[PDB]
Amino acid sequence: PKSMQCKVILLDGSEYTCDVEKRSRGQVLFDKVCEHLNLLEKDYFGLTYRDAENQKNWLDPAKEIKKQVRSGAWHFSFNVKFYPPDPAQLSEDITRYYLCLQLRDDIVSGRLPCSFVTLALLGSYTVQSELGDYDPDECGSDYISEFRFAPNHTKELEDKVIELHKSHRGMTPAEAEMHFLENAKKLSMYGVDLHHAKDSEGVEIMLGVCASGLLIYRDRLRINRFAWPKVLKISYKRNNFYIKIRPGEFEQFESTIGFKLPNHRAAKRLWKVCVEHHTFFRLL
Ligand SMILES: CN(C)Cc1ccc(C#N)cc1
Numbered sequence: 001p002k003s004m005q006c007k008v009i010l011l012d013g014s015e016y017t018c019d020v021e022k023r024s025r026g027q028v029l030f031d032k033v034c035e036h037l038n039l040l041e042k043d044y045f046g047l048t049y050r051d052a053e054n055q056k057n058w059l060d061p062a063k064e065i066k067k068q069v070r071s072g073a074w075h076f077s078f079n080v081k082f083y084p085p086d087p088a089q090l091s092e093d094i095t096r097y098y099l100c101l102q103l104r105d106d107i108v109s110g111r112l113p114c115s116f117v118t119l120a121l122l123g124s125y126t127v128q129s130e131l132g133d134y135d136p137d138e139c140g141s142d143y144i145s146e147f148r149f150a151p152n153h154t155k156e157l158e159d160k161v162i163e164l165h166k167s168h169r170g171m172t173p174a175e176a177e178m179h180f181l182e183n184a185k186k187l188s189m190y191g192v193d194l195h196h197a198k199d200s201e202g203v204e205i206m207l208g209v210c211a212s213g214l215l216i217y218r219d220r221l222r223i224n225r226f227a228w229p230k231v232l233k234i235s236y237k238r239n240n241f242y243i244k245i246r247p248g249e250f251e252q253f254e255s256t257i258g259f260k261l262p263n264h265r266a267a268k269r270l271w272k273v274c275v276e277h278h279t280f281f282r283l284l
Helices: 026-035 093-108 115-129 156-167 173-184 264-283
Strands: 003-008 015-020 045-050 056-058 075-080 193-199 203-210 214-217 223-228 231-237 240-245 255-260
Touching: 003 026, 015 026, 026 045, 026 075, 056 264, 075 093, 093 115, 093 173, 115 156, 115 173, 193 264, 203 264, 231 264, 240 264
Parallel strands: 003 075
Antiparallel strands: 003 015, 045 056, 045 075, 193 203, 193 255, 203 214, 214 223, 231 240, 240 255
């Protein structure tokens, strides 16, 4: 029975290696990674891989791994797929821990923009969880943490992390991770998956996929939002993506809104993530 080596980058930056049978469905690999992580609340997570166009794709757990990675390496990342709007309602501290690890990468990477003060507050909770109580022996006036807090580090940010860290004495790791999440969940780009697109006029926009629906970002003052319950049908055709909106009260007709994506693969990828969000957040 022939097996393929899988390499999975974990949220702590380490690499998990295992073997699966070459005809294995994605769920097989996911279940092994989740067992390695001691993770029971698995529904919020998934594996990503890079396609031949180097685009991030979710590994479909119902489909053969070989039919998704195709010509590419069996190399994957473990990631948050569905960002819970209220992390306090998760049943296990370890779920909140992996969510914190994902959000730290969202922040450092610039995917999750954040004010100075929120960067410093999130950093201070990470330091409290991982090192415990502030110690002045491991931090003089010139201290720079090993922890990555932001897409661009400044001395002023390091100073502010330490000032807030001092305020958290006695705080336990689950308590600090909960505080981290209570702040992170309020950021305007929390759990927003962004897709470059053009509107039916050719104007460049972003489409954001998240718990609260499909968001359209246009010119700054011009942004729209379609809550999932309002969306009856999601479809794609060639380079185009379509949402069918419920008729408004007393309106005779449904309305169909169309967008242009970079290529057919990008339209199909946006369709699949929208359908998956629509199903998940309908049930959660
Ligand atoms: C770090 N390398 C040894 C293998 C690798 C490369 C890329 C990904 C992804 N996704 C996972 C694993």
